[PDB]
Amino acid sequence: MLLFCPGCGNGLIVEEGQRCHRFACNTCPYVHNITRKVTNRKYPKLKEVDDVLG
């Protein structure tokens, strides 16, 4: 997903600190350590057609 820094509103990237994987902002010292599972499913469209014809 897309997450934004509460401080300045820039995009948050995922990096590694000294203890854990954390969201971080490229333009301010704001960080956020990851506590539990975070997921972003997309559910791409499946091929549904059987394609019998004629």
Partner 1 sequence: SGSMDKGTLGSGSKNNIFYILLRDWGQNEAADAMSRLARLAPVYLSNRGFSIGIGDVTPGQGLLKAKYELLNAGYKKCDEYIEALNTGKLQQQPGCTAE
Partner 2 sequence: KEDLPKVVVQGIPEVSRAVIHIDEQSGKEKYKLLVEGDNLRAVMATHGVKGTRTTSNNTYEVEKTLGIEAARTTIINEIQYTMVNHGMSIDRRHVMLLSDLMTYKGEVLGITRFGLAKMKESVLMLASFEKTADHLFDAAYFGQKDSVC
Chain-centroid distance, C-alpha 39: 7
Q: Residue from 18, 44, 46, 48 that binds partner 2 (CB under 8 A)?
A: 44
CA angle 19, 23, 25 (to 5 degrees): 120
Could you say whether residue 51 binds partner 2 (CB under 8 A)?
yes
28 binds, among partner 1, partner 2, Zn ion, none (CB under 5 to 8 A by kind): Zn ion
Q: Order of strands across the sheet with 31-33?
A: 12-16, 21-25, 31-33
Q: How far is the CB of 42 from partner 1 (least distance, A)?
A: 24
Residues at the annotated binding site for Zn(2+)? 5, 8, 25, 28
